[PDB]
């Protein structure tokens, strides 16, 4: 519960309906329920999980940044209190996702494609925790993101072509981690550039449709390089 009484297939079907309705909180709850059925997730289902929580946490992060900026300018308790409220709700979502990955998506992922997908997610949600972290565990949170990203990179480099869209999105996000979380902008720039160039040199192997998928993400790498250099 609360999704324990619903069929796995019905949860997946309703997740897709929620996406069409832009009801991402519903989408996430349905996909949480599907994961908790205990069966491994398909590629399409992994994408549904990621899209749902991406959008939920995306709204929370955008709200947190608005409130944090207001709080910074103000420096009564109301601004801090409400920023804390949003922050706490954000941390709860990140904890929920990390709990699904740890129980038991990652350990049951016996393919490079699935394992890399989930380790990237683990790095992303530790990164979102790091964005709001300030206390005695910020360094441990940051290292947990780095570690997850690094293991994903190691596997993706061994087992995936340089144009694979999950490998490219992983590298994009690890590069942003370096730039704005780890205060390593040169690492961030180096990774974005090497990832872009190695994908460019592999495009000749791709179909027209794979070419579109890969160049879409390559453009995000180029956008960041243009912003950072």
């Amino acid at each position: 519960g609360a999704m324990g009484s619903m069929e796995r297939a019905s949860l997946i079907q309703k997740a897709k309906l929620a996406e069409q309705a832009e009801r991402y909180e519903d989408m996430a709850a349905f996909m949480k329920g599907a994961v908790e059925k205990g069966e491994e997730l398909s590629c399409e289902e992994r994408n549904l999980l990621s899209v749902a929580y991406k959008n939920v946490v995306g709204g929370q992060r955008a709200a947190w940044r608005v409130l944090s900026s207001i709080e910074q300018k103000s420096n009564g308790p109301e601004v801090r209190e409400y920023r804390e409220k949003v922050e706490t709700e954000l941390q709860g979502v990140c904890d929920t996702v990390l709990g699904l990955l740890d129980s038991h998506l990652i350990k049951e992922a016996g393919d490079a494609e699935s394992r890399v997908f989930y380790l990237k997610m683990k790095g992303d949600y530790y990164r979102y925790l790091a964005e709001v972290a300030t206390g005695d565990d910020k360094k441990r949170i940051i290292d947990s993101a780095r570690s997850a990203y690094q293991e994903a990179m190691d596997i993706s480099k061994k087992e995936m072509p340089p144009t694979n869209p999950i490998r490219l999105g992983l590298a994009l996000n690890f590069s942003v981690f370096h730039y704005e979380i780890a205060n390593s902008p040169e690492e961030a720039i180096s990774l974005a550039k090497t990832t872009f160039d190695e994908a460019m040199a592999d495009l000749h192997t791709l179909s027209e449709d794979s070419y579109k998928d890969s160049t879409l993400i390559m453009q995000l790498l180029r956008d960041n390089l243009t912003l950072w250099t």
Partner: peptide, 5 residues
């Protein structure tokens, strides 16, 4: 612009 992920 904001960096992209």
């Amino acid at each position: 612009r904001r960096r992209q992920t």
